[PDB]
């Protein structure tokens, strides 16, 4: 029925895996509290590429020039009628040093460890399949 009657909000999430651990950045929304970490990334403008968005967003937020390669998983959710389309992609390489611009703390923790923390509701299904990818291995 309604296709174009809905608009998608595209968001790319970068899974920065170094040493076997993933990069988590502390940032909530309107919460006066902290402790909840998120997977760094950003919203995708239609005129920019999904990989390009991650690369530039991480360059702006994390001060790193990331190299996008292997896709992990995608998750869909809604924001008052609008469908947000999140892509968790694994960046196997990054140029620079990770810094937190719009984020408070930056931590490296293993996939299994990460899902035991207060991750955003969208980041959970994404990490679930990331650790799934390492444990089941789609290459078999």
Swiss-Prot record:
Effect of substituting residue 60 to A: Abolishes enzyme activity with dCTP and reduces enzyme activity with 5-methyl-dCTP
Residues the entry annotates as binding substrate: 39-44, 77, 123
InterPro entries on file: MutT-like, Nudix_hydrolase, NUDIX_hydrolase-like_dom_sf, NUDIX_hydrolase_CS, NUDIX_hydrolase_dom
Pfam families for the chain: NUDIX (PF00293)
Motif stretch (Nudix box): 42-63
One Gene Ontology molecular-function label: dCTP diphosphatase activity
SUPFAM superfamilies named among the record's database cross-references: Nudix
Outcome of swapping residue 42 to A: Abolishes enzyme activity
Cofactor: Mg(2+); Mn(2+)
Effect of residue 61 to A/D/Q: Abolishes enzyme activity
Consequence recorded when altering residue 57 to A/D/Q: Abolishes enzyme activity
Known catalytic reactions: CTP + H2O = CMP + diphosphate + H(+); dCTP + H2O = dCMP + diphosphate + H(+)
Self-association state and partner proteins as the record states: Monomer.
Protein name: CTP pyrophosphohydrolase
Species this protein is from: Escherichia coli (strain K12)
Lineage: Bacteria, Pseudomonadati, Pseudomonadota, Gammaproteobacteria, Enterobacterales
């Amino acid at each position: 029925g309604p296709l174009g009657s809905m608009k998608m909000i595209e968001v790319v999430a970068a899974i920065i895996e170094r040493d076997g651990k993933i990069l988590l950045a502390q940032r909530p929304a309107q919460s006066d509290q902290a402790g909840l970490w998120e997977f760094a990334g950003g919203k995708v403008e239609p005129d920019e590429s999904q990989r390009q968005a991650l690369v530039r967003e991480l360059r702006e937020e994390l001060g790193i020039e990331a190299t996008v390669g292997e896709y992990v998983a995608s998750h869909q959710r809604e924001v008052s009628g609008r469908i947000i389309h999140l892509h968790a992609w694994h960046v196997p390489d990054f140029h620079g040093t990770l810094q937190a611009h719009e984020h408070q703390a930056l931590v490296w923790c293993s996939p299994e460890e990460a899902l035991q923390y207060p991750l955003a509701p969208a980041d959970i299904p994404l990490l679930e399949a990331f650790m799934a990818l390492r444990a089941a291995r789609p290459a078999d």
